[PDB]
From Swiss-Prot:
<feature type="disulfide bond">
    <location>
        <begin position="148"/>
        <end position="162"/>
    </location>
</feature>
<feature type="active site" description="Charge relay system">
    <location>
        <position position="177"/>
    </location>
</feature>
<dbReference type="GO" id="GO:0046872">
    <property type="term" value="F:metal ion binding"/>
</dbReference>
<dbReference type="InterPro" id="IPR050127">
    <property type="entry name" value="Serine_Proteases_S1"/>
</dbReference>
<dbReference type="GO" id="GO:0006508">
    <property type="term" value="P:proteolysis"/>
</dbReference>
<dbReference type="GO" id="GO:0007586">
    <property type="term" value="P:digestion"/>
</dbReference>
<keyword id="KW-0865">Zymogen</keyword>
<feature type="binding site">
    <location>
        <position position="177"/>
    </location>
    <ligand>
        <name>substrate</name>
    </ligand>
</feature>
<feature type="disulfide bond">
    <location>
        <begin position="25"/>
        <end position="41"/>
    </location>
</feature>
<dbReference type="Pfam" id="PF00089">
    <property type="entry name" value="Trypsin"/>
</dbReference>
<keyword id="KW-0645">Protease</keyword>
<feature type="disulfide bond">
    <location>
        <begin position="109"/>
        <end position="210"/>
    </location>
</feature>
<dbReference type="InterPro" id="IPR033116">
    <property type="entry name" value="TRYPSIN_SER"/>
</dbReference>
<keyword id="KW-0720">Serine protease</keyword>
<comment type="subunit">
    <text>Interacts with SERPINA1.</text>
</comment>
<feature type="binding site">
    <location>
        <begin position="174"/>
        <end position="175"/>
    </location>
    <ligand>
        <name>substrate</name>
    </ligand>
</feature>
<keyword id="KW-0106">Calcium</keyword>
Amino acid sequence: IVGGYTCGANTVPYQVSLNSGYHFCGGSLINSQWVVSAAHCYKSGIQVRLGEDNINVVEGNEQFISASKSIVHPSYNSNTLNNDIMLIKLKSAASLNSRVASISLPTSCASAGTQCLISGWGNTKSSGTSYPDVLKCLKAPILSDSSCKSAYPGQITSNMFCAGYLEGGKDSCQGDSGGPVVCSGKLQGIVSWGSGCAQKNKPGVYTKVCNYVSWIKQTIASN
Ligand SMILES: [Ca+2]
């Protein structure tokens, strides 16, 4: 997260870190057994780390649970990033309390102008590289479809939306991938892609979670 703020420990209780020996992506806990992330975050051997603030220090609220299964969206295209969503099942159920909690799925899509919270452990610089240990947060609005398409001609599908600031300076970034965009207490987006980070006229692009609620529910019901 570039141009954000330190969230505070366990203030974003649905935020998870996906670990394969190291943090590599975010995700969102949606029930005691299941995490939503980006399909471009797929790999084998994932350990889900819940209750994290400093990802390099054991602070007392962590739950580390290996994944039993990953399900990339049936129509994910890694070239275009269309359908950039993946479900991960935990081998055991997380213990839920105020520091580790699920986030609700949307019942309706969000509109341009809605304020959201984007979070993660990704790079905090727009030029060069600095990875934080503690969770970072950014409040940002959803942008209009027309501004999003204008920013990224030929690239924005109906399964994507832009959020952030066209002036630059405030965005998600590498290492935030897969993590949440939460608006009014609902998971509306997944950190997906963008051109660099925090660049002028190049806002963040996010997977439009409301399109996937049917798939998520039916997949959980049978897996
Ligand atoms: Ca920790």
